[PDB]
């Protein structure tokens, strides 16, 4: 019943998580100077819609055509999901052996790879 807090702990202590980056403007400003492969941040969906079934975390990264983001959700029992932001349908993500950040890193960087190869 408390596994959500352990998943949040794993995300929020990681250096990729940027607690002071909230708006789209701040994301653009961040990647103006940063060479980081991706960031994690507090998603807009937390204050936006739904009625408290997930805690929402967004990833952001930059390719040659601009900034791309991915929305993730954690449910009350600690399960991870990728979230389609246009339909809000969820898709479960199984945690890789080395843990949650190891999982998100693979989901984000492989997705960035698909984007870059299509450009």
């Amino acid at each position: 019943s408390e596994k959500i807090y352990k998943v949040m702990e794993e995300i929020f202590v990681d250096r990729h998580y940027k607690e002071n980056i909230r708006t789209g403007e701040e994301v653009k400003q961040y990647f103006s100077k940063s060479k980081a492969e991706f960031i994690l941040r507090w998603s807009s969906a937390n204050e936006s819609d739904t009625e408290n079934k997930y805690v929402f975390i967004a990833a952001s990264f930059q390719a040659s055509d601009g900034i791309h983001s991915i929305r993730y959700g954690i449910n009350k029992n600690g399960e991870l999901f990728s979230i389609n932001t246009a339909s809000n349908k969820v898709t479960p993500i199984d945690i890789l052996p080395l843990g949650v950040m190891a999982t998100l890193t693979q989901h984000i960087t492989q997705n960035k790879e698909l984007i870059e190869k299509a450009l």
Binding site: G24, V27, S44, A58, S60, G66, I67, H68, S69, I70, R71, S82, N84, T85, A86, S87, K89, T91, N111, I115
Partner: peptide, 7 residues
């Protein structure tokens, strides 16, 4: 923000 959406 442009999001990566699958389904």
């Amino acid at each position: 923000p442009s999001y990566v959406n699958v389904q």
